RNA sequence: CAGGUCUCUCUC
RNA sequence: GAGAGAGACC
């Protein structure tokens, strides 16, 4: 992805868009009970903690574009995936606006505590002023659909979150590109059924993990991905996507029966306009971080990518022997013979993709179930029932989260969440965590899940 | 101060 | 089943 141009808002007649500049995050009552290296991300250009120009680092992610049109490997890759999707019988028909706004069994309603985006978030209009969960009123939506229309600018803010320190000195905070409610609604109308199917079907048919439940999904992965594992990390996946991958996506959506009107919407996320503060810019390539279908579209593109890489990198690759699961840029995959990702990464490079060894390994080693991660969690066979697989969030990550809070009113829920994550690491580790929590006054005030009960509840999920 | 998923907590 | 919160992940 590449920034094409940057004009003042005056020249473009776009409204200014300013986000918060002070972090909501404060050290929690556990900040000095647990070790951690992470601090709230740099939000503002005159942060004492900085060591580079802020805005420079912000948009460094857009590393450029290599390919703009699918070659033969990508075309063949697109087709193999779309064929695999055909057995899902995705409803290519347009979802109703009442449904697209207020949700279904398999697609959550549009979030209403959240910004309506351009231009409403500059005209003091909330989504609570356009939508009513209780009415399912869609009439006022229709109206604004027509006033402001489609293909509105995204609204660029900086993400409020913990970051490792190098990323704080080096200023590489992340960006939130807020879609307009208009585009969200229309995108949900166009692909809502696709969202539904994907959510209802995490696994190796969609090749997506969106909608999985890691407590239970983790036991199926060694069966869904038989054979030899491979894995790797991207840098700036979303931003690094060149327009070819959206061309590629278009092929898949077409092959599974989408009308050319529908397919025509992909160009609208490949080529986007963004307002950040007092300026307007253009991005060609790159997945807009906050458009409808980000996770699903990134997951599909990843499925196109992994196939293209294999058959352009190796001889006699049988794509049918490929199993993979993706959640955005995160991938786990298997093949009947080992795959050397050093070679995939070299091919990746030609495609504008920067692929590094899995989990910040210095070099591409072998990936096995004993060191694989997916969604940050490991794989750990239960000691009693070796076929039940524990997802293992690393305690290190769990301690990074507990040392901060955005509202200490909600400490209870926060610590309870972390325990649901921590117990999988085993009894010993968990009781170490709990008693560290208890080691502090409000820690003795919290209701903490019993390890035995967590386990018992887990076993009963099966 | 985006898009989502999952899980939990609270209430009718 | 519906409203209200939170947390993690992508
Ligand atoms: Zn443009």
Among A30, A23, A39, A40, smallest CA distance to A419 is for A30
Q: Who among residues 310-339 of A has its Cβ near strand B, under 7 Å? A: 328
A234 is in an annotated binding site: yes
Is A376-462 in the same CATH topology as A213-242+293-368?
Answer: no
CATH class of A376-462: mainly alpha
Tell me the CA–C1' distance in angstroms for A441 and C8: 25
Q: Residues 385-404 of A near strand C (Cβ < 7 Å)?
A: 393, 397, 401
Find the nucleotide nearest A154 (Cα to C1′). Answer: B2
Cα angle: A267, vertex A113, A16; to 5 degrees: 55
Specify the nucleotide whose C1' lies closest to residue A24 (CA).
Answer: B1
Cβ atoms of A250 and A301 within 8 Å: the answer is: no
Which window residues (399-438, chain A) lie with Cβ within 7 Å of strand B? 412-413, 416-417, 420
What separation in Å is there between the alpha carbon of A147 and the centre of ligand 1?
Answer: 22
**Residue A8 burial class via C-beta count within 10 angstroms: exposed 0-12, middle 13-18, buried 19 and up:** exposed
Q: How far apart are CA A191 and CA A85, in angstroms?
A: 14
Long-range contacts of A121-130 (CB under 8 A, 24+ apart): A121/A17, A121/A155, A121/A178, A122/A15, A122/A16, A122/A17, A127/A181, A130/A181
Give me the CA A339–C1' B10 separation in Å, rounded.
49
d(CA A193, CA A98) in angstroms, rounded, equals 14
A291 is in an annotated binding site: no
Q: How far is the centre of ligand 1, averaged over its atoms, from the C-alpha of A156 (Å)?
A: 15
For the CA of A462 and the C1' of B8, the distance in angstroms is 19
- Helix A341-350 to helix A294-313 angle (10° resolution) is 110
Report the structure determination method. Answer: X-ray
Residues with Cβ within 8 Å of A119's Cβ and at least 6 positions away in sequence, in order, are A15, A148, A152, A180
* PDB resolution in Å: 2.8
> Directed axis angle between helix A72-86 and helix A294-313, to 10°?
130
Every domain of chain A and the residues it spans: 1-13+70-202+243-285, 213-242+293-368, 376-462
DSSP lists the bridge partners of residue A334 as A229, A323
Total residue count of chain A as it appears in this document: 462
Rounded to 5°, the CA angle A407-A156-A411 comes to 10
Q: What is the whole-number distance in angstroms between the Cα of residue A282 and the centre of ligand 1?
A: 4
**The two structure tokens encoding residue A380:** 């750990």
User: Is any atom of strand C within 7 angstroms of residue A407's beta carbon?
Assistant: yes
CA of A177: nucleotide with nearest C1':
B2
CATH class as words, domain A213-242+293-368? alpha beta
Q: Which two tokens stand for residue A10?
A: 């005056």
Give the CA dihedral A157, A161, A163, A167, nearest 10 degrees: 10
CB A328 within 8 A of CB A299: yes
């Amino acid at each position: 992805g590449e920034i094409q141009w940057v004009k003042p808002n005056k020249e473009t007649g776009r409204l200014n868009i300013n986000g918060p500049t002070r972090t909501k995050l404060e050290p929690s009552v556990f900040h000095d009970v647990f070790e951690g290296n992470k601090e709230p991300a740099v939000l503002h250009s005159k942060d004492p903690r900085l060591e580079v120009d802020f805005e420079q680092a912000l948009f460094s992610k857009y590393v450029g574009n290599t390919l703009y049109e699918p070659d033969e490997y990508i075309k063949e890759a697109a087709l193999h995936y779309a064929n695999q999707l055909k057995q899902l019988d995705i409803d290519t028909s347009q979802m109703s606006m009442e449904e697209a706004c207020y949700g279904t069994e398999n697609l959550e309603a549009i979030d209403l505590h959240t910004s309506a985006g351009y231009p409403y978030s500059a005209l003091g209009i909330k989504k609570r002023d356009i939508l009513d969960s209780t009415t399912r009123d869609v009439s006022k939506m229709k109206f604004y659909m027509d006033k402001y229309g489609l293909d509105l600018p995204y609204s660029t803010y900086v993400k409020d979150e913990l970051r490792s320190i190098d990323k704080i000195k080096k200023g590489k905070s992340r960006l939130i590109e807020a879609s307009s409610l208009n585009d969200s609604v229309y995108l949900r109308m166009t692909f809502g059924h696709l969202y539904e199917t994907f959510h209802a079907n995490p696994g190796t048919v969609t090749g997506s993990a969106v909608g999985c439940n890691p407590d239970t999904f983790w036991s199926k992965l060694p069966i869904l991905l038989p054979g030899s594992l491979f894995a790797f990390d991207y840098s700036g996946y979303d931003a690094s996507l060149s327009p070819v991958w959206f061309r590629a996506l278009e092929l898949v959506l077409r092959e599974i029966g989408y009308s050319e009107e529908a397919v025509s919407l992909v160009e609208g996320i490949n080529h986007t306009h963004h307002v950040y503060r007092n300026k307007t810019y253009c991005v060609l390539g790159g997945m807009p971080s906050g458009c409808s279908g980000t996770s699903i579209f990134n997951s599909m593109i990843n499925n196109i990518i992994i196939r293209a890489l294999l058959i352009k990198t190796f001889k006699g690759i049988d794509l049918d022997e490929l199993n993979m699961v993706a959640y955005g840029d995160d991938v786990l995959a298997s093949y009947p013979f080992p795959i050397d990702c050093l070679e995939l990464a070299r091919t990746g490079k030609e495609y504008g993709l920067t692929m590094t060894p899995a989990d910040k390994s210095p070099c591409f080693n072998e990936v096995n179930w004993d060191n694989a991660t997916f969604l940050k969690r490991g794989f750990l066979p239960d000691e009693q029932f070796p076929f039940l697989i524990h997802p293992t969030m690393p305690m290190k990550e769990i301690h990074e989260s507990i040392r901060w809070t955005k509202d200490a009113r909600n400490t209870q829920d926060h610590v309870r969440s972390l325990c649901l994550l921590a117990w999988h690491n085993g009894k010993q580790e968990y009781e170490k965590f709990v008693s560290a929590i208890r080691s502090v006054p409000v820690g003795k005030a919290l209701a903490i899940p019993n390890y035995e009960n967590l386990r018992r509840n887990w076993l009963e999920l099966f």
